[PDB]
Structures are given as structure tokens and as C-alpha cells.
Amino acid sequence: CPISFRDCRGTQLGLGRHTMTPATIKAVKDTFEDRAYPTIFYMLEAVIHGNERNFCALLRLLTQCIRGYWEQSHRVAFVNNFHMLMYITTYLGNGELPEVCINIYRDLLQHVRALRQTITDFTIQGEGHNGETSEALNNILTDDTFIAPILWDCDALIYRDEAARDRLPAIRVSGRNGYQALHFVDMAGHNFQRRDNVLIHGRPVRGDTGQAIPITPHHDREWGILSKIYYYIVIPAFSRGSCCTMGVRYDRLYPALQAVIVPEIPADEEAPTTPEDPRHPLHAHQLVPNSLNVYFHNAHLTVDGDALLTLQELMGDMAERTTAILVSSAPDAGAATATTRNMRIYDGALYHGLIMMAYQAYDETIATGTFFYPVPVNPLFACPEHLASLRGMTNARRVLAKMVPPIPPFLGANHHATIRQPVAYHVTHSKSDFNTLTYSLLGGYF
Amino acid sequence: GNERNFCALLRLLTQCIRGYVAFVNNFHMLMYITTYLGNGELPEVCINIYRDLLQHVRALRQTITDFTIQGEGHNGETSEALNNILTDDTFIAP
Amino acid sequence: LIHGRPVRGDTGQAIPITPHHDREWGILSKIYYYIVIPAFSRGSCCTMGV
Amino acid sequence: FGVYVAEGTEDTLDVQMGRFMETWADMMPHHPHWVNEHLTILQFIAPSN
């Protein structure tokens, strides 16, 4: 399957369909090959771990942060996450943000929507068998069996294990089968060093937590479809396989989060805004070593005392610890026969994992491997560069890793998985455009 | 070219470059600048210039990478440096 | 020679000398020095001591 | 390396991946077959492969 063939077939597929403006594409570039992306953004992404309540709880700080980050290099941020940018679009649309960033987000999201529409178009509706929709029987991005690399609420798993019903499913979560998915974990039950197979589903905005209440998905069916298409298209579309996914360590992360140096402002006086005032949180007289304020000041971002106080409400809900999820399935009825039942497929994914843009190893501000440990599970997301963050990093491992993507067997062998090496080669070595590459990859996924 | 020395000049190096592109001469300071002096404290155009230069360098490194096959080493020496001097540790910068 | 004081490390006198950077340091520095710099100078720059 | 699938060992994935890392140091006895995808059609269809 020549690369030129893939590009041309994508070009045909993207004949009359939408494309991004040069502004958006150059912005997303400037973002991704910027190694100087401040890590505190990853920190807040991890701590909120895609909870809609968490997002709704931090309006002011988030808007001021994205503002100051953009009106300093015209670079957009937060791009990797699936469950924040659309949260911005849903909520941060009154007009408070600069029109350029929100327009970029709108353009990219409706482009993703048009990709979904394209997948709808080139299939025929009305052809179901054994309870499977034609959409799922044609493409893999629409089959709820296949999952995204990163999952933060078990709703996708709920869709998966309600969907197949004929494919024999098997889920391994640190050995023993099955999950429990206890939601809305507090301070009194943090247990960062917890070994059980429970899952953190989050706090639904409109509902009652309870204890015997059965788990409820936080979103609809096609939310997962958008997640899968976004992850498997746009990120490979721009990173060109440079990015990587990995886990975090809340046991050391959370303790660093309490350092708040907000001053007890005198009552009924206007809050300082410019950083030059010692009363301002960003000012040096309120700058103390080993604190969140210096973490921000490294990124040179102006923030207000109330926004920093908002973290005290933020710590209402905790995130327990990253884990590995292995899902196995049989081929669907489209390829179901007497000899392929045992002939199954497996896939590994990260729960509460996170993806960073470009590996960096040359900063004195933060030591190596302080918060994150590089755990990629994808031929697509191979990150031989990121492996330098791993403890006990040697030379032989690095030199041999350039020519093989290291994926642990408990996370999925390449041959038995969906994404194989050749498509990774294609996405990493096709240098034609970006919209064309998006369409080519999308067309591949049949 | 020592980062301990570099990380103590933030202020003065900021004002000098802001008043003045410069300091493009040797490797042992430009990428340090983009590593630490790289959050927009300076006028953004210079940051773009430095970023473009460094990404160009690593892109050429990618070029030298993909134009050889991997996994053939001898005498305990890596495959890729068997392609070019610029990739071989036996060679030294001037 | 002078190695320059390491940032994250311990001073010592008998403590063995340690590199300040990884292997990509050398290749990136070499590429930068021998390719873009001459292409920008065309042999107009010069190297000298202090 | 490309056919074997293991199970979670009830850990924080820190020790797991690290141990897998040194395990992968000597697990490779030769060049994996699925690495030379950079080859074009010709030498691919050549009888040597």
C-alpha cells in the first residue's frame, strides 16, 4: 500500500469536504513542536481528569490562563485533552475569550464532526445483524468495541460491554478480571496506595451519588465516537508520532498542589491585579521556594488571588492512580467463523493517563521523572525520545528503542492488536500536507 | 556554557537582548535560552526564530536518521553512526 | 581542564567527573556547528582564543 | 516481543514498566522481522526476504 496511494485516496475522500484555515493549522503546529509547553497545564489536566464538575468549578483561572498563554505567543494550549476543549466551547463561548482561539476550536471541532459525517456518508444505513449497527459494521471508529487509548470515566467501558454481546469479551485490570468503578472519591478515602481494581467515574453534575446507585455514563453514545476519531486522527495528524502517552503519580503530585500563597486581603479593598504590587500573588514578596506561585512564574503567567483560592474547592474530588486496562474481543459477525473464534484481538489502554506534546529533558526547573512516567501503549504513539524520563535509563535501551517501539506484553502485542506498524510508518513518513493526511488516515480506518 | 552560570543572569540577559538577533554563535547557549528563556518574557518573534532554527536542526537529525537502516552494529558500535561522521561520537566539534 | 560545576550534583574533589548532557547533545551540537553556521557565514566567521 | 501478551501484576506500573525495560534489554536476540517497513516493493518481493 504505497504512501502516495494513501495520499491520493485521501485526496479523493477529502474532495469537497471542509478544511482548516492556515491560521488554525499554523497555530496547532506552533503548539505541538513547542517543547516549552508549561507542565502546570498537564498538572491541572491530570487533577481535573476530565470531570465536567471540575471544569465548571474553575472558570476564572482557566480563562485567564488560556488568555495569558495566547496573548504572549499566539499559541493555543490544552490541545491534547479530549474532555476540556469542547468543555471550553460548551461553556467558554459567551465572548470572554479572544475570538481567535474560540474560532480555532470551533473550526477544528466542526472539522471532526465533518469527518464523522464523511464516515456516515460512505456507508449504507439499515443493515444490522446480531444487534450491530451498520455504522459499527463498516468502520472501527464507530464500533463501540474498539476503545480510545485514554479513558477517564468508565462509560466507554459500559458502552463496550453492552455493545458486543456476541464477541466474547475479557477485561484485565492489574490481573484480576472485572471492575467496580466507585465514584466521587473524597479526602477521607483517598488511599493513593490502593491496589484494588476500583475505578474513578467522577461526579455527575445532574444526579445523586449515593452508594448502591448503579453507575451512570456521564455522556451519550457518540461522545465516545468523537473521542476515538479525535485521538486516532488529529493527534497523529500533527504530532507525526512525536508525542507520547504516560502515567502520573498523584501520591507525589497532590502534595505539591496545596502550596497557596494568597494574602489575607484587607476587607473592602480592591483586589490587586498587576503583578508589580507586593499584595499581588505573583509579586516577589509573595514568591516563596517550593510553591505553586513559582511554578506559575516559571511560565510567566499572571493570576489572581481568588483564582488560586478556587483550588481549595477544587480539592473536593481526588484522582486515585493511573492504571492499565486490557480488553480482548472476538472478531464481529462480519468475520465470525468456526475457526476464528479463538482468533481474537487484544488492546491496551491507560486509565487516567495523559499525553504530552514533545519530550523534553534539559530543564533544571523540574527534575526528570518528578511527576510522570512514560508508559506509551500504541505503535502510533511510540516515543523513543520520551524513554529518557524512565528511571534507570541506560544507553542500550535507548539505542535499541529507536528501531522498535517498546510496548510491554501486558499492554498488547502488535500482531494481535488493531493498529499495526505499517500505518504508523505511513503517518510518520508521509510529508504532503495535513488535511490530506487526515483524510487518508480516515479512509484507512475501514 | 554552564547552565548553573546561565540560570543566574535571567534579568540582565533579558534586558540586553530586549534592547538589542544576537547570541546565535555557539550551541551551548541558544538551546538553553529556548529551554528556560522560552515562555514569552521576550518579544515573541525572537522566540519563533530560535524555535524554527532548533526544529530545523532536529529535523536534519531526522533526515540523517531515516536515510539509513537500523540494527547493524559491530565492535559494540551503533548502526546509525556507521553512516556519517556527524552521527559518530568519535568526531569532535571544533 | 575545567569541567564547569554541575548543577544537580555534588561538588567533591575526588568525586569522579561527570558529563553535563546526554548523547544527543553531541550530535545536535555537531550538526548545528558544521552545517547551518557555515551556510550562514560562507567562511566569513573565524575561531580564536581569549 | 510482538506476539506475547501478559497480565497486570497488581502494581503502580512504575515497577512494571521498569522491570519490563531491563527484561527487554536481553529479550532481543536478533533483528525483529517487523521493523523493515521502510523497504520498497522491489527488495520486498525479492526472494531474499
Swiss-Prot record, chain A:
Species, as recorded: Varicella-zoster virus (strain Dumas) (HHV-3)
Name of encoding gene: MCP
Sequence similarity: Belongs to the herpesviridae major capsid protein family.
General function of this protein: Self-assembles to form an icosahedral capsid with a T=16 symmetry, about 200 nm in diameter, and consisting of 150 hexons and 12 pentons (total of 162 capsomers). Hexons form the edges and faces of the capsid and are each composed of six MCP molecules. In contrast, one penton is found at each of the 12 vertices. Eleven of the pentons are MCP pentamers, while the last vertex is occupied by the portal complex.
Source organism superkingdom: Viruses
Lineage start: Viruses, Duplodnaviria, Heunggongvirae, Peploviricota, Herviviricetes
Positions of transmembrane segments: none
Span covered, complete protein: 603 to 1048 of 1396
Protein name: Major capsid protein
Subcellular location(s) of the protein: Virion; Host nucleus
The protein's assembly and partners: Homomultimer. Makes the hexons and eleven out of twelve pentons. Interacts with triplex proteins 1/TRX1 and 2/TRX2; adjacent capsomers are linked together in groups of three by triplexes, heterotrimeric complexes composed of one molecule of TRX1 and two molecules of TRX2. Interacts with scaffold protein; this interaction allows efficient MCP transport to the host nucleus. Interacts with capsid vertex component 2/CVC2. Interacts with the small capsomere-interacting protein/SCP.
UniProtKB/Swiss-Prot annotation, chain C:
Cellular localization per UniProt: Virion; Host nucleus
Function: Self-assembles to form an icosahedral capsid with a T=16 symmetry, about 200 nm in diameter, and consisting of 150 hexons and 12 pentons (total of 162 capsomers). Hexons form the edges and faces of the capsid and are each composed of six MCP molecules. In contrast, one penton is found at each of the 12 vertices. Eleven of the pentons are MCP pentamers, while the last vertex is occupied by the portal complex.
Family label: Belongs to the herpesviridae major capsid protein family.
Domain of life, per lineage: Viruses
Source organism: Varicella-zoster virus (strain Dumas)
Listed name of the protein: Major capsid protein
Lineage, highest ranks first: Viruses, Duplodnaviria, Heunggongvirae, Peploviricota, Herviviricetes
Subunit structure of this chain's protein: Homomultimer. Makes the hexons and eleven out of twelve pentons. Interacts with triplex proteins 1/TRX1 and 2/TRX2; adjacent capsomers are linked together in groups of three by triplexes, heterotrimeric complexes composed of one molecule of TRX1 and two molecules of TRX2. Interacts with scaffold protein; this interaction allows efficient MCP transport to the host nucleus. Interacts with capsid vertex component 2/CVC2. Interacts with the small capsomere-interacting protein/SCP.
Curated annotation (Swiss-Prot), chain D:
Record localization: Virion; Host nucleus
Name under which the protein is recorded: Major capsid protein
Gene coding for it: MCP
Record function comment: Self-assembles to form an icosahedral capsid with a T=16 symmetry, about 200 nm in diameter, and consisting of 150 hexons and 12 pentons (total of 162 capsomers). Hexons form the edges and faces of the capsid and are each composed of six MCP molecules. In contrast, one penton is found at each of the 12 vertices. Eleven of the pentons are MCP pentamers, while the last vertex is occupied by the portal complex.
Lineage summary: Viruses, Duplodnaviria, Heunggongvirae, Peploviricota, Herviviricetes
Protein family: Belongs to the herpesviridae major capsid protein family.
Subunit structure: Homomultimer. Makes the hexons and eleven out of twelve pentons. Interacts with triplex proteins 1/TRX1 and 2/TRX2; adjacent capsomers are linked together in groups of three by triplexes, heterotrimeric complexes composed of one molecule of TRX1 and two molecules of TRX2. Interacts with scaffold protein; this interaction allows efficient MCP transport to the host nucleus. Interacts with capsid vertex component 2/CVC2. Interacts with the small capsomere-interacting protein/SCP.
